[PDB]
Amino acid sequence: NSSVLSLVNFTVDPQKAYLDFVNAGGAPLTNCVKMLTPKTGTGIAISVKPESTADQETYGGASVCLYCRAHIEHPDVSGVCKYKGKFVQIPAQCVRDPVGFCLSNTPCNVCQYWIGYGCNC
């Protein structure tokens, strides 16, 4: 943790820096805050309350945000984090690297499910 977190402070593209690190064998960021949930949710990517389906796990949003975890500027032109204060659903097969998954994907702009993991548009 304290290494990959240290790494993404030595680069201009923290998203690419993290992904290249874990794509080359780096240990994913640990200690993401996994919640216990009734697997009866809608399955959207980001939600005010947990929304995991039986195929998903829910995390506290700040804990899966690279920018929150590394204490660096968020890239949102709004300056407001998309995850913090909310909950984020991750496909269950991807719990090994929740942060890597979030950096690697984008919720659907119309249906709010993960593109390729729920979006049916």
């Binding site: 200690n31 949930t37 009734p38 009866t40 506290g60 949003g61 700040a62 804990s63 913090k84 204060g85």
Partner: protein, 291 residues
Amino acid sequence: ASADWKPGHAMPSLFKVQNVNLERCELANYKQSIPMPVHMNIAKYMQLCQYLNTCTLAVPANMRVIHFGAGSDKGIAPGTSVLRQWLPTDAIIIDNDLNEFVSDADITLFGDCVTVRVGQQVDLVISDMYDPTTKNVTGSNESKALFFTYLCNLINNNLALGGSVAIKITEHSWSVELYELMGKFAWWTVFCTNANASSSEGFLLGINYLGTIKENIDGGAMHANYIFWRNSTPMNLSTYSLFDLSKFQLKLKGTPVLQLKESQINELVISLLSQGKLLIRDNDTLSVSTD
């Protein structure tokens, strides 16, 4: 095994009314851990929340919740996220810790809790604070000051009538003054989660603040009663209560917030306060900053 499916154990009046010396706490399963599927504090906080689901908590719109001791040595705040999952979506969470962390709170303040200046009154105080030096046990187990001085003043000044508190204590991390302040609530207990049953930890609960003395409590004797209870009560580690979470979220009670002068507080108002049906405090915008 009924109790295994409960979120934990609450101190019964059987032990509240005893009168005994303060003895050493000796738990049979001391420091045994239960495996989690997930940080242990997830299950601890959810069990506390489940028990508070059985209490007459006031649950207004724009509920004001402050969470002290929210950080971990990992830089995250599992308890705050549980509070986010539990509380109404429009609840305001302010959390605080000595050390840096990141959380799903609305407002996060670093530094000693004493630097946390609350301009208004809040509706719910959660404290998980514990000072590392309490581990240096030398001599008598005496009432502690530490952050309890701050919390006691908070209860007396910055807590709405009808508001509640849940404050972590242990065998050695405890305060005579805080126990005595439980006598200013409609009801009080100590709640011990099943997930951490092997610890002398308990959450001292004051339910529905009344601002006036309802029960005269000898705080030193009451801590001796709490330890006598722990020493007398087998508690099996368990998270069975988290197997069914269909009703985990705090009920959306729409509790009203009223402004009232002290002299207007009649018997009707006290009854409503004591039932979780009313809060008395400002309806301004909340201001919680570091000083």
